[PDB]
Amino acid sequence: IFSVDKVRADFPVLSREVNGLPLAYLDSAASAQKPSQVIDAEAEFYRHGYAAVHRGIHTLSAQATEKMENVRKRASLFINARSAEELVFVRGTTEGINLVANSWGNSNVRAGDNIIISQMEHHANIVPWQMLCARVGAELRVIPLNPDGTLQLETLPTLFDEKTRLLAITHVSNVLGTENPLAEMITLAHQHGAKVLVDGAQAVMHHPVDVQALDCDFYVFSGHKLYGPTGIGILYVKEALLQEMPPWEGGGSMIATVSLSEGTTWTKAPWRFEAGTPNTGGIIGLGAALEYVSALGLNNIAEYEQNLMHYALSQLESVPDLTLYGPQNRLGVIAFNLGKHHAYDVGSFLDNYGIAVRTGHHCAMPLMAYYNVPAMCRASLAMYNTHEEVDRLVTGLQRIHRLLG
Amino acid sequence: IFSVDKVRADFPVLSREVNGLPLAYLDSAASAQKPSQVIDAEAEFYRHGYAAVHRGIHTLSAQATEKMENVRKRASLFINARSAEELVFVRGTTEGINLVANSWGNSNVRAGDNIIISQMEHHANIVPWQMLCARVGAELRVIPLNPDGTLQLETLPTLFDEKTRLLAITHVSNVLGTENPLAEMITLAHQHGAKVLVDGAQAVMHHPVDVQALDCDFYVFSGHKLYGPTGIGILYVKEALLQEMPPWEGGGSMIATVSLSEGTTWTKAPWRFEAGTPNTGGIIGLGAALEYVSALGLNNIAEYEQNLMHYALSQLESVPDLTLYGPQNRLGVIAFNLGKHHAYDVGSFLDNYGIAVRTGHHCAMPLMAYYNVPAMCRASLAMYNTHEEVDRLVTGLQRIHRLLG
Numbered sequence: 001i002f003s004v005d006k007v008r009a010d011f012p013v014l015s016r017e018v019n020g021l022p023l024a025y026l027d028s029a030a031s032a033q034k035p036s037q038v039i040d041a042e043a044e045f046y047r048h049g050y051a052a053v054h055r056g057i058h059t060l061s062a063q064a065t066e067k068m069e070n071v072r073k074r075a076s077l078f079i080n081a082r083s084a085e086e087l088v089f090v091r092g093t094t095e096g097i098n099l100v101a102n103s104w105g106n107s108n109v110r111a112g113d114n115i116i117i118s119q120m121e122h123h124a125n126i127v128p129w130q131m132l133c134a135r136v137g138a139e140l141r142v143i144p145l146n147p148d149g150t151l152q153l154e155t156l157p158t159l160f161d162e163k164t165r166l167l168a169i170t171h172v173s174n175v176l177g178t179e180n181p182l183a184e185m186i187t188l189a190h191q192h193g194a195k196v197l198v199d200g201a202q203a204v205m206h207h208p209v210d211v212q213a214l215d216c217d218f219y220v221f222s223g224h225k226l227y228g229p230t231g232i233g234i235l236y237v238k239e240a241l242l243q244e245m246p247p248w249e250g251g252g253s254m255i256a257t258v259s260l261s262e263g264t265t266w267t268k269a270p271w272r273f274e275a276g277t278p279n280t281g282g283i284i285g286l287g288a289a290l291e292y293v294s295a296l297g298l299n300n301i302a303e304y305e306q307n308l309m310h311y312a313l314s315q316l317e318s319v320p321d322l323t324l325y326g327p328q329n330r331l332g333v334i335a336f337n338l339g340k341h342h343a344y345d346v347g348s349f350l351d352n353y354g355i356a357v358r359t360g361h362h363c364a365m366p367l368m369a370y371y372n373v374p375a376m377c378r379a380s381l382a383m384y385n386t387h388e389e390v391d392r393l394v395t396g397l398q399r400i401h402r403l404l405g
Numbered sequence: 406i407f408s409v410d411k412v413r414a415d416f417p418v419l420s421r422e423v424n425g426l427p428l429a430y431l432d433s434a435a436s437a438q439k440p441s442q443v444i445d446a447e448a449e450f451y452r453h454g455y456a457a458v459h460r461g462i463h464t465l466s467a468q469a470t471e472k473m474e475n476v477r478k479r480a481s482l483f484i485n486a487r488s489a490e491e492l493v494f495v496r497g498t499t500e501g502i503n504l505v506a507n508s509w510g511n512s513n514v515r516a517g518d519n520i521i522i523s524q525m526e527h528h529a530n531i532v533p534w535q536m537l538c539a540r541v542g543a544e545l546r547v548i549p550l551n552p553d554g555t556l557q558l559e560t561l562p563t564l565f566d567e568k569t570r571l572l573a574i575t576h577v578s579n580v581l582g583t584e585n586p587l588a589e590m591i592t593l594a595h596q597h598g599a600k601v602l603v604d605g606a607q608a609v610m611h612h613p614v615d616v617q618a619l620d621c622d623f624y625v626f627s628g629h630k631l632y633g634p635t636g637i638g639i640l641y642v643k644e645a646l647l648q649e650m651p652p653w654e655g656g657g658s659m660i661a662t663v664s665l666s667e668g669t670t671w672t673k674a675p676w677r678f679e680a681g682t683p684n685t686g687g688i689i690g691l692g693a694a695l696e697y698v699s700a701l702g703l704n705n706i707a708e709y710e711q712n713l714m715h716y717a718l719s720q721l722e723s724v725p726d727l728t729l730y731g732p733q734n735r736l737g738v739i740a741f742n743l744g745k746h747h748a749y750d751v752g753s754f755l756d757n758y759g760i761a762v763r764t765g766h767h768c769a770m771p772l773m774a775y776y777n778v779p780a781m782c783r784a785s786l787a788m789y790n791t792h793e794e795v796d797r798l799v800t801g802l803q804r805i806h807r808l809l810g
């Protein structure tokens with residue numbers, strides 16, 4: 001069983017004071033706080049083992065190379081990829097989607113083709129496809145939303161045809177908390193010979209993830225939402241697809257030979273997609289974050305978070321004029337608006353109480369437009385949040401409503 | 406005046422033992438060790454101030470945004486750019502060169518044009534231009550080398566013509582330690598209406614750098630060679646050029662509006678080139694590294710390093726059959742080969758003595774080919790290296806020569 005008090009004791013920021021009051025950090029979906037196991041793994045690497053990591057000859061560099069390839073292996077086991085060499089280190093979900101859009105998209109999507117996204121997608125999983133469509137002259141098609149925040153799956157027959165090259169779809173919405181039926185949608189997509197990129201930035205911290213059972217062709221997520229350091233993420237690509245993809249960035253470490261008269265040749269996958277010095281510090285910290293989450297157990301995390309969410313939804317019923325967005329089985333986040341007040345004002349009052357929520361369009365403007373609002377408030381309920389913090393949020397919304405109503 | 410013993414006391418890795426013997430880290434040109442001021446600035450941010458940084462409403466996020474924009478301002482003053490908004494945060498020199506090659510290259514280099522590089526360039530400043538030339542059908546021209554490791558500047562009239570769009574040139578060679586006459590070459594390049602990208606990865610830690618006096622159009626360098634964390638670098642672009650450049654990566658934070666029916670519009674420079682969550686941890690640490698270097702004084706650093714280099718070159722005269730590569734006024738690095746022994750073996754023996762040097766082609770295969778060797782050894786003499794470490798290197802080369810000769 002899970003003990004939130006033992007977990008919170010690992011997170012030094014949770015002691016912080018904001019505006020003179022104790023912090024209630026409800027914004028983990030934007031970025032998670034980090035346990036000291038993660039902070040100290042990075043610091044300890046810089047203090048005792050730091051070196052360049054390109055199979056250098058001397059000891060520190062050879063050992064640093066081995067630490068980095070061990071994190072690649074550990075990350076691959078975490079998502080149950082067949083092979084560590086199916087994982088590419090990127091700066092984050094965004095860069096990983098851009099790498100696919102360029103390396104695989106430019107050589108597999110031609111004029112007259114179409115790509116399918118959904119209306120709930122984060123901008124990271126929209127803009128790179130808009131750019132690709134403009135480069136090659138293809139069409140971007142959109143799975144629309146139902147009022148409860150789920151996909152209208154009945155529209156799929158009109159959107160998939162023989163020219164559909166790619167479905168790019170979110171595993172879990174960063175605003176609605178909707179989880180999409182990935183396994184079925186992927187089966188449908190593969191019947192037309194389309195590939196599927198899955199945006200998993202909001203999934204990997206809430207429950208186990210298994211890319212072999214999903215059978216997705218690409219999967220991406222970010223370290224910093226997985227209780228890890230900034231500047232590091234994972235792109236998973238099926239081995240058969242990955243060894244056909246050309247390089248994106250060029251430079252050191254991704255070449256096999258460089259000649260100014262005979263041209264340049266590339267090295268093998270993963271490493272052909274990693275140009276220049278990697279973010280070794282971030283990679284070490286990411287490994288520690290995966291060890292930490294695995295030590296708690298994603299199933300224990302999922303159970304505690306689901307209970308916390310049901311408590312919060314039960315308590316928020318007593319907030320007058322609260323509008324919620326998304327399904328009742330939401331994971332992780334609660335998107336809401338308070339009466340007619342602008343989200344920006346609600347968030348400012350909540351910050352004044354020491355409660356950190358996020359306001360605005362949440363990098364999902366098409367989703368905001370579907371609901372005909374300019375912005376929403378969003379509260380994240382992560383594994384280190386407590387019933388008392390939910391109570392502070394409910395009380396605060398009540399006070400804001402009395403004061404401003 | 407400079408005190409190497411007070412400086413070394415800030416670097417915890419310099420106490421390390423390698424193979425049972427005290428480390429002599431002579432590989433800073435591949436990546437520098439970090440002072441605890443840098444390690445602790447990053448750790449302290451994660452411990453007390455961590456949050457997402459996109460002008461979020463709550464306190465932690467607003468303060469994190471301000472820390473990041475302050476580091477941008479500090480970096481801009483460090484290289485004497487006119488404006489902080491001329492600096493783009495990238496993963497490193499390599500990504501910065503790839504960003505220029507794509508965003509500016511694709512819309513300014515057309516079939517029939519030429520680009521000029523030099524024969525001493527790091528792969529980071531070759532491969533992105535080879536890729537660009539293949540994309541648009543332009544020609545890559547090369548300034549050749551003299552035997553002493555300087556550029557043959559007499560060839561410039563045959564290489565610059567009215568179709569030359571870009572000179573991409575290293576400020577300081579990572580192998581030879583040659584410093585190139587940037588100011589004059591830039592004057593020549595601008596007379597033909599060519600832009601100049603300067604690869605400054607090996608310059609910013611050895612002496613002051615002033616992009617207004619250079620008048621370069623682009624300048625790039627990496628945090629991790631500047632005693633800072635991995636995963637962070639700086640790309641400087643002249644404001645007039647930068648506000649004309651289209652985006653490269655797409656996603657959150659670089660858009661102004663996103664619409665699935667009316668298309669997407671971009672935000673203003675710097676920020677239009679920064680998609681997704683930035684590497685906030687790296688940015689904080691980079692700021693501390695700049696404060697640290699500025700507190701020592703780059704002129705004090707330059708003086709101590711120049712003295713150390715002259716001592717080393719004087720001592721290495723007593724090593725039999727030592728071949729050196731590059732000019733006598735080299736900065737930072739000494740590239741050498743020992744008799745007929747392969748660099749790999751020399752480096753392995755030196756590692757066995759606890760001396761970390763680098764061996765191989767140093768991400769500069771065209772440079773190796775010019776000298777008709779497959780590899781070289783390279784010793785870096787950074788601000789925290791000592792006369793005693795030079796003595797260990799000289800003694801070691803002598804022992805290796807006796808043993809293997």
Ligand SMILES: *Cc1c(COP(=O)(O)O)cnc(C)c1O
Pocket residue numbers: 252275276277434435496497498499500527529530575577578579604605606607627629
């Ligand atoms: C090391 C170096 C690079 C590559 O920088 P990264 O940090 O690996 O992206 C490019 N040019 C020179 C001269 C270098 O020394």
Ligand SMILES: *Cc1c(COP(=O)(O)O)cnc(C)c1O
Pocket residue numbers: 029030091092093094095122124125170172173174199200201202222224657680681682
């Ligand atoms: C935050 C997030 C992203 C963006 O990830 P970055 O780390 O900023 O690159 C993309 N998709 C979803 C669903 C997210 O929650």
